[PDB]
Write a protein that binds this DNA or RNA. Structure first.
Ligand SMILES: [Mg+2]
Ligand code: NA
Ligand code: NA
Ligand code: NA
Ligand code: NA
Length: 320
DNA sequence: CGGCAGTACTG
DNA sequence: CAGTACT
DNA sequence: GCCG
């Protein structure tokens, strides 16, 4: 990053807009920061700034203030509530609306939340694991967790395929959580497996809390055995084999990469989801789908790129 | 002006 | 539904 | 916030 002295100041504003609910402005900032982090050389001119996609007049102005003064005056006027809103929205299951409500109600600390807030079932688990969920784990521990799930799944049906996606599959040295995708090549035997799989992972104490228990998605909490272990977030998705490539693509990410790819598909009259890549998609004036279109066959990730007119990118090149 | 990705789950 | 979450 |  050639522009740390700029992006460090910009990230502060972005986070402030985010926790305060100004999601589109925060999005704009996030995109400007990534763009700034990817420039080859320090940005030294307004006109150079404007030349970067993702940097407009308002943002170039801010970059200019930083270079000339080493500071951004807007930082001095960030609401005093922001550190508390961030504290609160780092509880899993609480977002900006809940954080703002707790703030309005007078809460200022996690002790206030613990003792006086009404928490959802998910938020109570999030609070119990507040520190742990803010920590990343070594890649090697994500391997142990993925293997734990795979061993439990394969015990039921040895044909089940399980793959850790997310940051793990993108090759990162640490992972915020573990994202396990499960399918079955025969196209049928993925069905109805959660009850038995989840029950199995509970039996020996690996699965400690459940956050979401859907027909296709599980989100919860696990902890490996022995001393020195922290609770870790674990997501499991079970998909039919026909959707494997799009599910793999979605669940490998990154999130920004997915949004970029999906926006591209939209420009070409297509739609990309975790279920499928579709063509001849009918939309309205607001970009909203009014007609479904046709599912395109995508046996592999490479086919999704191909049909979008893109060169294939290995997971490591998707870490946007 | 107005989209900014597309979807699953909860209560 | 609004809110939160996933990548 | 940026961009079509
Ligand atoms: Mg993840
Ligand atoms: Na630009
Ligand atoms: Na949260
Ligand atoms: Na109090
Ligand atoms: Na996850």
């Amino acid at each position: 990053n050639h522009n740390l002295h700029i992006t460090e100041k910009l990230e502060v504003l972005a986070k402030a807009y985010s926790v305060q609910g100004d999601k589109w402005r925060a999005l704009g900032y996030a995109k400007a920061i990534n763009a700034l982090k990817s420039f080859h050389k320090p940005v030294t001119s307004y006109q150079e700034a404007c030349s970067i996609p993702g940097i407009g007049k308002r943002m170039a102005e801010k970059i200019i203030e930083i270079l000339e003064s080493g500071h951004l005056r807007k930082l001095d006027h960030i609401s005093e509530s922001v550190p508390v809103l961030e504290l609160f929205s780092n509880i899993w299951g609480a977002g900006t609306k809940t954080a703002q409500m707790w703030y309005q109600q007078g809460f200022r600390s996690l002790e206030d939340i613990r003792s006086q807030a009404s928490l959802t079932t998910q938020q109570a688990i999030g609070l119990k694991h507040y520190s742990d969920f803010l920590e990343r784990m070594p890649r090697e521990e994500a391997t142990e967790i993925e293997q734990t799930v795979q061993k439990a799944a394969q015990a039921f049906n040895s044909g089940l395929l399980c793959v850790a996606c997310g940051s793990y599959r993108r090759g990162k040295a640490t992972c915020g959580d573990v994202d396990v995708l499960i399918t079955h090549p025969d196209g049928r035997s993925h069905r109805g497996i959660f009850s038995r799989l989840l029950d199995s992972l509970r039996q020996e104490g690996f699965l400690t809390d459940d956050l979401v228990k859907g027909e296709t998605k599980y989100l919860g909490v696990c902890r490996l055995p022995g001393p020195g272990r922290r609770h870790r977030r674990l997501d499991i998705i079970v998909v039919p084999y026909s959707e494997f490539a799009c599910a793999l693509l979605y669940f490998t990410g990154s999130a920004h990469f997915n949004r970029s790819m999906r926006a591209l598909a939209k420009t070409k009259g297509m739609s990309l989801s975790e279920h499928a890549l579709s063509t001849a998609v009918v939309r309205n004036t607001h970009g909203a789908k009014v007609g479904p279109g046709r599912v395109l066959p995508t046996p592999t990730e490479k086919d999704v790129f191909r049909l979008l007119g893109l060169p294939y990118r290995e997971p490591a090149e998707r870490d946007w």
